[PDB]
């Protein structure tokens, strides 16, 4: 299962 | 370069045997950016039922892809892969050698 | 070494003036691709690429689809912020790549976590192995580092790599166990390839093996022939196995002083094989 997206760059 | 030119191998899935079902494979690897043009040719003409794998990349960040199609070799049917990418002057062409 | 890995590989590519960046994901256990996602599909959803992930039900697929749809939007913001940091024009196509995952040992526990990024094919920023700090490639990636340190985002990454990644991989190994925990040894042979009464190529083949890691080498009475070997890089058969060969031009008449040597995790004992006339 992929990781929940974090803050953008 | 921050654009690497694709390496190209053409090969069959199984050791060829004329008049026997196989898959013709064109493996392109080591390229950046990800836009690329691959055709498989028979006697110089474009094969239409061609599939490729999902786009992936190596630890050096360079992309790779396998293009493939069902086929049935014959004693001198001439198969090849034609590849265009922004790092090339013109399309690159690799003949299928059944011994490689 | 009873050891395993899970990795997700993301590529986002912008295409200014032509609608939003394209987002593509693939997922691997060891060398087996098992999931994909493509934002350009007519209905973008995560899809099975191996038969053993199908046993997860529709809720699993929905959840991951939501993840990917959200990641796509996040990578678009990123692309926008990157173009700014490098002072690039609005018209060019750019690439943001992500790779992350875990390595675990036979005990199932975490050996190493990974989470890092590339802009336009070059290292940008990576989570260090302590999972608590970052390495930034240049002053633009320090701008990102400052944001992610202010937010303590490495804590959230750590939680995923130590806590989630590890348990999902175990789950997948348990679903896929006869295909993921089994090595397929190379079927092998040596072909004779005479160029004249001048020369002769002994090409050595290893076909149909899994995983991809292998060693093929030649000898001359014992001595490694590194200089005088042509080796193809290892390549997919397209059935989830791999191939490689190694060739060597040998003076015509001296062929049977030469021995190909195959090492791969699928064989109890290394192979020392020869040409069969």
Numbering used by the authors:
A (entry chain C): 1 to 9
B (entry chain B): 0 to 99
C (entry chain A): 0 to 276
Q: What do the study's own words say?
A:
The HLAI residues that are polymorphic are mainly those forming the peptide-binding groove, which contains six binding pockets (A to F) that define the size and chemical characteristics of the specific peptide repertoire that can be accommodated by each HLAI molecule. Cognate T-cell receptors (TCRs) expressed on CD8+ T-cells detect pathogen-derived peptides presented by HLAI molecules on the surface of infected cells. In this study we focus on two HIV-1-specific epitopes and their presentation by 4 different members of the HLA-B7 superfamily, HLA-B*07:02, HLA-B*42:01, HLA-B*42:02 and HLA-B*81:01. We show that single polymorphisms between different alleles of the HLA-B7 superfamily can induce a conformational switch in peptide conformation that is associated with differential HLAI-specific escape mutation and immune control.
We next analyzed the structures of HLA-B*07:02, HLA-B*42:01, HLA-B*42:02 and HLA-B*81:01 in complex with the well characterised RM9-Nef epitope. Pro2 and Met9 acted as primary anchor residues and Arg1, Val4 and Arg7 pointed away from the groove for potential TCR interactions. The total number of contacts, buried surface area and surface complementarities were comparable in all four structures. Despite distinct selection pressure at position 1 of RM9-Nef by HLA-B*07:02 (R71K), peptide residue Arg1 was in a similar conformation in all 4 HLAIs. Leu6 was in an identical position within HLA-B*42:01 and HLA-B*42:02, but moved by 3 Å in HLA-B*81:01 and 1.5 Å in HLA-B*07:02. These differences were mediated by polymorphisms at residues 156 and 152 within the α2 helix. The larger side chains of Arg156 and Gln152 in HLA-B*07:02 pushed Leu6 up compared to the smaller side chains of Leu156 and Val152 in HLA-B*81:01, changes which may be linked to the L76V/T/I selection that is mediated only by HLA-B*81:01. The four closely-related RM9-Nef peptide-HLAI structures show that similar conformations do not preclude HLAI-specific selection pressures, such as for R71K, that is only observed in the context of HLA-B*07:02. Our structural analysis demonstrated that R71 (position 1 in the peptide) pointed up, away from the HLAI groove and could therefore act as a putative TCR contact. A dominant R71K mutation in the Nef71-79 occurred in those with HLA-B*07:02 but not B*42:01/02 or B*81:01.
